[PDB]
């Protein structure tokens, strides 16, 4: 595939040199042609990107998204020279979908643990921000929402890489505990702060799923570290507790309830799979199950304030 993706890059560059010609000399038919050609590129890239999503190749998906941003850059300049609304509307719609897609891929990249793909995804997200910032003369709230998600992902990655450094160094379980413990604290405080300013339901759903994926990463790092069942208990309880109170902040609806439930209980199920793998005794299995069920109980009884 990469050869086709690079043909799109070459096409885009020829269009971009033609956009210099549109500044240096100018023609409506040239602007029309590069606009249409860039849409044809965008459709080619989108077609590859949907196939890459279905196949699960994140590297190709990120490459295709970056090419979609490269196309969006030239599209935005073409629209700026032409004074054109249709292209700017197309650009905002495409960029907003790309933001959602790259968010979902970035969640997946953190979930699979290849943080270099996540870093590349955030690089692309900065380029999406460059497009959005050029695109809107007016809207601040879209930028706030994107940047809040970015600040959350960055904070989660700062914890993730601090833990991964401890894991690479072979650090003692007590340091892994105190780092993870304060990681969950900082996640909670940042989520609480972000919850003051965000208001898009889909963004809130994203943000919660990100906090959940960050807790999941912390738990899986502790499992890769081979920690004691006492550590698995303490951290799982603190993690579910944080993820519950963050649910009590963010949750407002059946849609958010369903997410909170699915995430919390999946995280507890994954925790119980670590207890199964280490062979922890039945009282630990009961303790974790009770903590999980008491979270589900509290999620229902919080939800019953609204339902």
């Amino acid at each position: 595939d990469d050869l086709l993706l690079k043909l799109l890059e070459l096409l885009v560059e020829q269009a971009r040199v033609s956009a210099e010609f549109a500044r240096r000399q100018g023609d409506e038919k040239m602007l029309e042609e590069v606009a249409r050609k860039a849409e044809e590129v965008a459709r080619k890239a989108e077609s590859i990107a949907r196939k890459a999503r279905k196949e699960g190749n994140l590297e190709l998906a990120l490459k295709a998204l970056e090419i979609l941003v490269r196309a969006a850059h030239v599209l935005a300049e073409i629209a700026r020279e032409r004074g054109n609304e249709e292209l700017q509307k197309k650009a905002h719609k495409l960029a907003k979908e790309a933001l959602r897609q790259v968010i979902e891929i970035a969640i997946r990249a953190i979930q699979e643990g290849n943080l270099e793909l996540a870093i590349i995804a955030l690089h692309i997200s900065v380029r999406i921000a460059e497009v959005l910032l050029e695109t809107r003369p007016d809207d601040r709230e879209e930028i706030r929402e994107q940047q809040a998600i970015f600040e959350l992902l960055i904070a989660a990655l700062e914890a993730a890489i601090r833990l991964e450094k401890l894991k690479e160094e072979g650090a003692p379980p007590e340091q892994i505990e105190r780092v993870a413990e304060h990681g969950l604290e900082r996640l909670k405080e940042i989520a609480k702060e972000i919850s003051k300013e965000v208001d898009s339901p889909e963004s809130k759903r994203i943000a919660y799923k990100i906090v959940a994926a960050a807790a999941e990463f912390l738990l899986k790092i502790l499992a890769e570290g081979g920690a004691t069942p006492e550590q698995l208990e303490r951290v799982t309880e603190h993690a579910l507790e944080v993820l519950k109170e963050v649910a009590k902040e963010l949750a407002d609806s059946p849609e958010s309830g369903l997410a909170a439930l699915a995430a919390i209980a999946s995280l507890a199920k994954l925790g119980l799979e670590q207890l199964k793998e280490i062979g922890a005794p039945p009282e630990q299995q009961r303790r974790v199950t009770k903590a999980g069920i008491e979270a589900v109980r509290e999620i229902y009884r919080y939800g019953r304030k609204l339902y």
Binding site: E40, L258, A262
Partner: protein, 314 residues
């Protein structure tokens, strides 16, 4: 007499006398019936811990679950689903307002081993699409056919747009077990539905349009052109309007004449949007745009006239 059989079942499951008494104490406080208690005995035979069953009983009462919703926990337990995952499915099904048939279809998705988040998102999708439980049962059959969860969402979104019956979704699961790709299953759904409609309404113009679409689709190396042409065939086979028939026949004839995939997609997309739409002035302007195209001296004028029509109708 029969209330003793629950104690016998729990004793055969190896539950101790004080645990049977404690479970009976909970069942008495909660007022739960002998078959709800039999479902608790089946969870005990599935190896679910007595102290977890106390939470399952409590939760069923605090939710106000009906006996069949309680019974579905035993099927999920014998499918190997955890007490907590059972609590997910039930707690969600309650706020979703699901009926026992939809809950039994969730138990079948549990027997298919689908992840609880994917089950709940599939249930949310079926709820938002306003579908009946047979669509959930057909989604479970697509799970038995091994179709990925967002491809189930594609097949549901397609079947909803196309007004198909649930047995077409069952036949899509049969095509999935035959190893056909989800895009090709969509093409087969489209073509077979267009011809099933043509068997109900065998008009010469319907037969010509459906044939010309199937021909153009069989000629095309591009599956966007296939899906456009076969969806246009479904819309024309449901239609009773001479303007839609003329517009679709002109677009298919122009697409059978032309050698450019872009003009082909423009003409078919314009005809599809005109057939989705319901405005006689848009239909008149589209028929005019097809005259302007067929009588054109320049292919760039074909492209820009069809673009202006598409970008007004979309």
């Amino acid at each position: 007499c029969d209330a003793i059989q629950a104690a016998a079942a729990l004793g055969e499951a190896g539950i101790s006398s004080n645990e049977i008494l404690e479970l009976l104490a909970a069942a008495a406080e909660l007022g739960l019936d002998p078959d709800a208690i039999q479902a608790a005995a089946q969870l005990g035979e599935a190896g679910i811990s007595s102290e977890e069953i106390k939470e399952l009983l409590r939760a069923a009462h605090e939710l106000g679950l009906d006996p069949d919703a309680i019974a579905a926990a035993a099927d999920l337990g014998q499918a190997g689903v955890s007490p907590v995952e059972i609590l997910a499915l039930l707690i969600a099904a309650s706020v979703l307002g699901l009926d026992p048939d939809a809950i039994q279809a969730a138990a079948a998705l549990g027997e298919a081993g689908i992840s609880a988040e994917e089950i709940i998102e599939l249930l949310t999708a079926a709820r938002d699409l306003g579908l009946d439980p047979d669509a959930i049962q057909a989604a479970a059959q697509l799970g038995e056919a091994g179709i990925s969860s967002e491809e189930i969402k594609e097949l549901l979104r397609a079947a909803h747009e196309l007004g198909l019956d649930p047995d077409c979704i069952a036949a899509a699961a049969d095509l999935g077990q035959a190893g056909i790709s989800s895009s090709e299953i969509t093409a087969l759904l489209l073509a077979a539905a267009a011809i099933e409609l043509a068997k109900r309404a065998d008009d010469k113009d319907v037969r010509e349009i459906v044939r010309d679409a199937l021909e153009l689709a069989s000629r095309s190396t591009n599956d966007e052109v296939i899906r456009l042409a076969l969806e246009a065939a479904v819309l024309a086979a449901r239609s009773t309007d001479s303007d839609v028939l003329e517009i679709v026949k002109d677009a298919l004839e122009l697409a059978k004449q032309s050698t450019n995939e872009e003009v082909i997609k423009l003409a078919l997309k314009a005809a599809v949007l005109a057939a989705k739409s319901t405005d006689e002035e848009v239909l008149e302007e589209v028929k005019e745009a097809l005259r302007r195209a067929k009588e054109s001296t320049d292919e760039e004028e074909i492209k820009e006239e069809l673009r202006k029509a598409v970008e007004e109708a979309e």
